[PDB]
Design a protein around this ligand. Structure first.
Ligand SMILES: O=C(N[C@@H](CO)C(=O)O)c1cccc(O)c1O
Ligand SMILES: O=C(O)c1cccc(O)c1O
Ligand SMILES: O=C(O)c1cccc(O)c1O
Ligand SMILES: [Fe+3]
Length: 174
């Protein structure tokens, strides 16, 4: 098992003055990069969506909806506010076997069109990280997509570790 090393947190910017209420709602995954993400031209990555909902204790209810094997698949997690706004840790980490750490950092966002989010986890002692380019719609300008490519590269990732999921209508239009 071989992995590109997780970048130092100093190389991962934090979105300033993070507004947690404005980050709520559905985001489409228009770009996906990481040391475990690989471009697969035979069976290309389908677009999925992630929905953020503020609980009254100001932690997030996070639901991901994916189109897999002709059905809609639902992954639930809780994001608990971390050291500073825009940073999060994972709730009920014990319910995930082999998972020792999980970090979420909102790198950049304008809340109503786009967002870039950095994730880092240690699972079975292996360090994984990913950057998601979130779009409020299924499509984003080639400029924003290029910014995402340059940011992914700055964290050590080559082009074959950066994918742009193909837009779909099943499951993610709810
Ligand atoms: O790369 C990741 N996971 C792969 C499995 O190890 C994957 O299949 O996407 C990954 C990295 C950081 C944070 C994550 O939630 C995550 O799924
Ligand atoms: O369980 C998944 O496949 C999944 C879906 C959306 C986001 C993730 O991080 C996941 O691990
Ligand atoms: O974000 C998650 O729900 C999650 C938790 C543990 C392991 C994963 O890969 C995840 O995507
Ligand atoms: Fe994950």
């Amino acid at each position: 098992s071989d992995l590109i090393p997780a970048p130092p947190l100093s190389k991962v910017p934090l979105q300033q003055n993070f507004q947690d209420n404005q980050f709520q709602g559905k985001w489409y995954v228009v770009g996906l990069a990481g040391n475990a993400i690989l471009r697969e031209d035979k069976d290309p990555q389908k677009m999925y969506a992630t929905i953020y909902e503020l609980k009254e204790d100001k932690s997030y209810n996070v639901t991901s909806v994916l189109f897999r094997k002709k059905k809609c698949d639902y992954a639930i997690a809780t994001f608990v506010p971390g050291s500073q706004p825009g940073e999060f840790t994972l709730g009920n980490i014990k319910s995930y076997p082999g998972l020792t750490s999980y970090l979420v950092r909102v790198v950049s966002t304008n809340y109503n069109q786009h967002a870039m989010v950095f994730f880092k986890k240690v699972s079975q002692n292996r360090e994984y990280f990913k950057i998601t380019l979130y779009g409020r719609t299924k499509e984003l300008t080639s400029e924003l997509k290029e910014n995402f490519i340059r940011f992914s590269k700055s964290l050590g990732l080559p082009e074959n570790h950066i994918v742009f999921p193909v837009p779909i209508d099943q499951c993610i239009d709810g």
